[PDB]
Design a protein around this ligand. Structure first.
Ligand SMILES: Nc1ncnc2c1ncn2[C@@H]1O[C@H](COS(=O)(=O)NC(=O)[C@@H](N)CCC(=O)O)[C@@H](O)[C@H]1O
Ligand SMILES: Nc1ncnc2c1ncn2[C@@H]1O[C@H](COS(=O)(=O)NC(=O)[C@@H](N)CCC(=O)O)[C@@H](O)[C@H]1O
Lengths: 335, 335
């Protein structure tokens, strides 16, 4: 695969708004995120649509593609980071400068709607992109959880590429929709013990593919959707969905023969899942959809909309040890 | 194509709940729909999940598939009608008895989420199915709008298959979210003049394909999504969506090269579209996404979630005369 240069303390991070104009609509949280990374020693380059609004989005399709492309053209930038997701990143895909991405590989990082770009860029270029922090939701998070997010971010992107990397498990996590865009917290978030579960036995090693599942529907069937292959590990997460929507998306995967191919599934923790009073969890819904197909599942990986968030390279081999309850990166993902 | 026998007054209609359990949650409107069709002279057979609830759905995936299949097996049933949509019809697709459908073709009719079934059945069998009335939302509607819906339903399904059929445009329509499941009415719905627009010139004739666009994402890429071919007329409608979602869905189509194949697009009236203050309509968003592609568009066809609703056969040729501002069925769609 195509690999970007690793991150280092003091590097320049460029940010872009490929969908929701949250540098305006969540300006306080944005400023907190900016200050957080600056105090860590990073230099920041603001994308050209920072501070702009086109109602539900940061700008036109072409304006947003231009914003992203301009960061790719900047030789000083090591990391290109999403400000926030939304709904509309998939629009940009016909207009991204893929040749420039290949010529100037950089760390591309974000999550949620930005999945369209992460997956699309990988499909077109083979570049290993990252499911991880977006500036506003991830680094604008109040302490204590932001520190754990940062620890993963800096560890994954700066570590020496020697031997496997085994993930730490966050001690506590939260998904509460509070403390969003103000100077002070209203009150501390509920801190849940980590209830991540490893359903299965032995070790499964394979290329990880996926991201935000709802977002994948916007690129599905196109040349920008990476082909899922035999032996892949499917990584999927969703946010604030009804159980009805979760069944729909799982069945979509079933119909597409995804569950005939993959050797394991990683479910990211689902932020504020709405069970409609059924008290069922997404894993139970997946089990029904699977219809007896035995696939080992890591249920509740901390790489999703919940806090804290781990950083995950997409398109490289992972090993999930279901016996020892851990997950590792086993393939080089940066230069 | 595989063609069902035409409907006749006095025939038996079977109904099924492939997703939301609205025979329970909208019981008053359900009873109104039942009484409406019975008064017209139709006999009704209730699917086995009528009156059942599994929280967000009528029952398990397999039970819902069985409910539908049992109606196919009933020799007295000439029309199989959805009670209502939801989110979860796509789950049923691996379990529908397609061979039984081929062996005894019937009129299959519904809309919204039921698109998954209409499209899936067409993909597997070539049966001409119908985008049209569901028992609860369509026939549980209060007069006067229900009468116009019924007029189309009965005309399309009972008429002699000789010569083209040209649609009659409803004089007035509504999308107002009142008088749903209430026993009585305080006032009639606000009525709007029909603002259907024909953007283009000349005449376009091609096979119509599509349905509820959001629902199509649940079957996309699979063997149950009928292939869109050169010359097709794309029919798409959505309900209660944000402009953000609408851009995402239009861009999905663009990425899939759909706009390189279609001869025209029909946009169904979008029930309670949320423009996010932009004052933009779906057509304007489509125009941006198209990026200069000169595809003629029928904007605001009355075959969607708005009232009244016309009945449309899927998978047969239509002719849209953009100069004379009309739309016709030009291919035999019942035996
Ligand atoms: N006013 C508010 N109050 C408190 N939390 C808020 C918020 N606005 C955004 N958030 C939180 O910010 C996180 C990231 O938002 S985000 O990136 O735009 N999300 C997305 O793109 C995905 N929701 C799109 C995919 C989908 O679900 O269909 C989400 O986890 C979301 O919970
Ligand atoms: N409580 C309520 N008050 C007033 N109206 C209500 C209602 N519950 C349902 N409705 C109306 O019923 C109509 C049909 O509903 S329905 O078939 O389940 N819809 C669907 O399946 C599609 N919404 C799913 C596709 C999608 O948009 O993602 C929709 O037009 C909807 O407006």
């Amino acid at each position: 695969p195509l690999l970007a240069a690793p991150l280092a303390v003091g590097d320049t991070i460029g940010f872009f708004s490929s969908s929701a104009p949250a540098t305006v609509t969540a300006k306080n949280r944005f400023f907190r995120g900016v200050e957080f990374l600056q105090r860590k020693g990073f230099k920041l380059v603001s994308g050209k649509l920072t501070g702009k609004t086109d109602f539900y989005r940061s700008g036109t399709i072409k304006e947003r593609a231009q914003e992203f492309n301009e960061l790719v053209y900047n030789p000083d930038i090591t990391c290109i980071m999403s400000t926030i997701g939304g709904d509309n990143s998939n629009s940009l895909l016909p207009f991204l400068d893929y040749d420039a991405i290949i010529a100037n590989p950089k760390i591309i990082i974000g999550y949620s709607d930005t999945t369209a770009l992460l997956a699309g860029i990988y499909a077109k270029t083979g570049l290993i992109t990252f499911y991880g922090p977006a500036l506003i939701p991830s680094f604008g998070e109040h302490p204590p959880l932001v520190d754990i997010t940062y620890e993963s971010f800096i560890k994954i992107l700066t570590r020496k590429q020697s031997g496997i990397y085994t993930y730490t498990l966050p001690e506590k996590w939260s998904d509460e929709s509070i403390n969003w865009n103000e100077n002070k917290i209203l009150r501390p978030k509920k801190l849940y013990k980590n209830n991540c579960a490893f359903y299965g036995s032995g070790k499964v090693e394979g290329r990880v593919i996926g991201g935000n599942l709802n977002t994948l529907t916007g690129i599905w069937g196109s040349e920008w959707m990476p082909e899922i292959r035999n032996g892949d590990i499917l990584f999927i997460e969703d946010s604030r969905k009804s159980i009805a929507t979760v069944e729909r998306l799982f069945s979509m995967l079933k119909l597409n023969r995804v569950f005939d191919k993959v050797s394991a599934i990683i479910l990211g923790k689902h932020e504020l899942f709405d069970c409609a009073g059924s008290k069922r969890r997404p894993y139970e819904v997946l089990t029904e959809v699977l219809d007896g197909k035995q696939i080992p599942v890591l249920d509740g990986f901390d790489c999703s909309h919940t806090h804290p968030m781990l950083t995950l390279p997409l398109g490289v081999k992972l090993a999930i040890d279901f016996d020892n309850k851990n997950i590792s990166i086993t393939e080089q993902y940066l230069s």
